[PDB]
Design a protein around this ligand. Structure first.
Ligand code: TQ1
Length: 268
């Protein structure tokens, strides 16, 4: 990207994406900032197809709680994706370890998270890796869903399909990914949003994984909310978490009903 880097300072690394590292690029003349995701397609034989899909999905998106996609180009074996620079950083860094953040801040972010996910689901897209590292903040602390490297289409027009791919980040994945050969897309994203809410409120992930052998998950199934992280969480948001972190995805709360939840609507 020699002409580009003559005019744009690749100032620093912002982070890792599913398929590559993301850099802050600043135009020397205009000082416009853009995020440049740099993907080495030689790292996997299926990387070209995979990054092509991320690009394709990105072209479908336009929402205030989704990271803007500006464009892309290839040079040799490297794919460059040009994305909104979200100057508020990752939601992850608003979460004080073992403490979380103030409840009003968690609620606001959660509302914005719901808005983004509703939008994605409405266009038939599931993100599949919702976590604080993939939720960015703009200059006014508006939440933006980031990184569609693991995203896929679960509804073609008005026809849903079941998914089967075990992907995502283990502490955030729904138990059906470890239990059912096929499953519905939307409840998996709802579950990860519940784990994000948990992390925001208590600064602590509740379990390594929602599997039968994970004691911390068994403790939750057994309603032991007198243990961490749950004992740090007020009963109101905890009541919502009780509805989101339901093992049977068919019994799990849907987003329309999350919007009816008492804590969701609570003036703080
Ligand atoms: O601005 C962006 N666009 N895409 C991304 C992707 C990541 C990786 O999570 C990313 C990570 C961090 C930051 C940031 C940190 C501080 C201010 N901003 C921006 C990011 N970022």
């Amino acid at each position: 990207a020699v002409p580009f880097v003559e005019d744009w300072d690749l100032v620093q690394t912002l982070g890792e994406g599913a398929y590559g590292e993301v850099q802050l690029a600043v135009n020397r003349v205009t000082e416009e900032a853009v995020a440049v995701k740099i993907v080495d397609m030689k790292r996997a034989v299926d990387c070209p197809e995979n990054i092509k899909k991320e690009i394709c999905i990105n072209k479908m998106l336009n929402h205030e709680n989704v990271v803007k996609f500006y464009g892309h180009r290839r040079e040799g074996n490297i794919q460059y994706l040009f994305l909104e620079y979200c100057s508020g950083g990752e939601l992850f860094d608003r979460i004080e370890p073992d403490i979380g953040m103030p409840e009003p801040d968690a609620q606001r972010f959660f509302h914005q998270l719901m808005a983004g996910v509703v939008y994605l689901h409405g266009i038939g897209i599931t993100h599949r890796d919702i976590k604080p590292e993939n939720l960015l903040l703009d200059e006014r602390d508006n939440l933006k869903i980031s990184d569609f490297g693991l995203a896929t289409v679960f509804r073609y027009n008005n026809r849903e399909r079941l998914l089967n791919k075990m992907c995502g980040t283990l502490p955030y994945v729904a138990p059906e990914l470890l239990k059912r050969r096929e499953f519905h897309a939307e409840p998996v994203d709802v579950w990860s949003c519940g784990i994000v809410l948990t992390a925001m409120l208590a600064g602590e992930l509740p379990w390594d994984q929602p599997s039968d052998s994970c004691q911390e998950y068994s403790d939750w199934k057994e309603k032991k909310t007198y243990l961490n992280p749950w004992k740090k969480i007020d009963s109101a948001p905890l009541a919502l978490l009780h509805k989101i972190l339901v093992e049977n995805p068919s019994a799990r709360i849907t987003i329309p009903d999350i919007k009816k939840d008492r804590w969701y609507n609570k003036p703080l």
